[PDB]
């Protein structure tokens, strides 16, 4: 029973993030906080809406076709009509099964990817001022108040400003 330590995406999701799909949780001098990342959130949504527009890219319109139920036994021609239709249904049933499996694999992959993409982006910002804790979190080796964390989420963090302070905490 450990409350207090925050943790990242490595084998845990955040039930408490209801204003976005991806985001940051921080712990610093001023306490803790949380903020969604709209950009990666929107990127996942756009991709998923696209598949779901293409999958629903409008039905086929069919009118007069062939009969598919029969009140009389007839032999050869009816056999063929039933076989044609059974063949069509099995092939479409296969198409549907495969489509869903492929699309769901892809949905999972692209959502995982957005997550990792946001991690790497953050890591690139931090340069030598932080280390990967291994749990989806960075240890930032300098005083980083709410405004500081904000600059990271905002993409305006200047690593040079804190570099001396951080290198000193990391090593010597």
């Amino acid at each position: 029973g450990i409350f207090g330590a925050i943790a990242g995406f490595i084998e845990n999701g955040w039930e408490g993030m209801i204003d976005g799909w991806y985001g940051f949780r921080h712990q610093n001098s001023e306490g803790t906080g949380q903020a969604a990342d709209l950009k990666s959130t929107q990127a996942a949504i756009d991709q998923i809406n696209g598949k779901l527009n293409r999958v629903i890219e409008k039905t086929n319109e069919k009118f007069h076709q062939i009969e598919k139920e029969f009140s009389e036994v007839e032999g050869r021609i009816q056999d063929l009509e039933k076989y044609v239709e059974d063949t069509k249904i099995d092939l479409w049933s296969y198409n549907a099964e495969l489509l869903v499996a492929l699309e769901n694999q892809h949905t999972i992959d692209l959502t995982d990817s957005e997550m990792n993409k946001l991690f790497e982006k953050t890591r690139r910002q931090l340069r030598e001022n932080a280390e990967d804790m291994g749990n989806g979190c960075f240890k930032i080796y300098h005083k980083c108040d709410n405004a500081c964390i904000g600059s990271i989420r905002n993409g305006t963090y200047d690593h040079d400003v804190y570099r001396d302070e951080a290198l000193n905490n990391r090593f010597q």
Partner: protein, 321 residues
């Protein structure tokens, strides 16, 4: 309490829900995602919406009885439809008949989409017209199919009938005609004099020729006799010839043929005052989903029939506690 003032922790994460749902992937058979959507339509309202397709409810009539002009189907004269609906309670109540290749005539009429009928002035020299039967009551009087002309002896003979009707129009004409099969060798001569009639109906490139067959069939509405129904399509520029020695059930004109989106469906579903593009025998179904397992029989803009009753498309990421 509180953490050191010298460092900070910044974690990256994704949301999760307490109510995840299971979907299928290539990798795993059951993986929990945050949200998903059904791709198989499996329910119907139970009603055939009468909009936007023109639905013609056959009620007590099959399309063929509406075509021939069975008296209780008189209300269908010259009717049109996108989808004709045949009901299981439908019944025939005219001269007992059969249609060799019934299904083809039913199909081509269904697809043509109209019973628009045009009377033509056939001259029938030497025979009596408009024969009627007690098996085809039209009020209290004996009667017959509206679109057919039961010809029989006049005076005491039945001269070789021999008439023509050119198609000088821009559309195909459909002619419905018949051959009468009497039950007794004594019924045959009594109506048509000759002991073995014939009906030859021809165009320039095609001909059908039918010889009647005397004999008793099962009693239907008082009768062991039958009529067999045939058809002939006459293209623009072509000519119809009708030659008969007897037993001819003559057409009174033609049905104007069309091409288009018309069809026919067997269903007992009530007609609904509502709007739906996709129709099944179960009733109309929505078409927001790409697939459906309601019925392989459909009409209109419909999801594709599949065997699965459910297919869940992930619409969110993997759900992780």
């Amino acid at each position: 309490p509180g953490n050191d003032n010298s460092t900070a922790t910044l974690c990256l994460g994704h949301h999760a829900v307490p109510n995840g749902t299971l979907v299928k992937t290539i990798t795993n058979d059951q993986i929990e995602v945050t949200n998903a959507t059904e791709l198989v339509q499996s329910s119907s309202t139970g009603k055939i919406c009468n909009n936007p397709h023109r639905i013609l409810d056959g009620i007590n009539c099959t399309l063929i009885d509406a075509l021939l002009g069975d008296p209780h189907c008189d209300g269908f004269q010259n009717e049109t439809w996108d989808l004709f609906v045949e009901r299981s309670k439908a019944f025939s109540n005219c001269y007992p008949y059969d249609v060799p290749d019934y299904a083809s005539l039913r199909s081509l009429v269904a697809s043509s989409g109209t019973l628009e009928f045009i009377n033509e002035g056939f001259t029938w020299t030497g025979v009596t017209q408009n024969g009627g039967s007690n098996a085809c009551k039209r009020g209290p009087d004996s009667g017959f199919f509206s679109r057919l002309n039961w010809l029989y002896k006049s005076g005491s003979a039945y001269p070789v009938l021999n008439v023509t009707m050119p198609n000088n129009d821009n559309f195909d004409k459909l002619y419905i005609w018949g051959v009468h099969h009497p039950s007794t060798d004594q019924e045959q001569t009594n109506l048509y004099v000759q002991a073995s009639g014939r009906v030859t109906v021809s165009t320039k490139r095609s001909q059908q020729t039918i010889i009647p067959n005397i004999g008793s069939r099962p009693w239907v509405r008082g009768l062991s006799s039958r009529i067999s129904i045939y058809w002939t399509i006459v293209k623009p520029g072509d000519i119809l010839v009708i030659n008969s020695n007897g037993n001819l059930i003559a057409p009174r004109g033609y049905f104007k043929m069309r091409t288009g989106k018309s069809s026919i469906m067997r269903s007992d579903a009530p007609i609904g005052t509502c709007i739906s593009e996709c129709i099944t025998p179960n009733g109309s179904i929505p078409n927001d989903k790409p697939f459906q397992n309601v019925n392989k029989i459909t009409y209109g803009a419909c999801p594709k029939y599949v065997k699965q009753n459910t297919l869940k498309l992930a619409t969110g990421m993997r759900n992780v506690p």
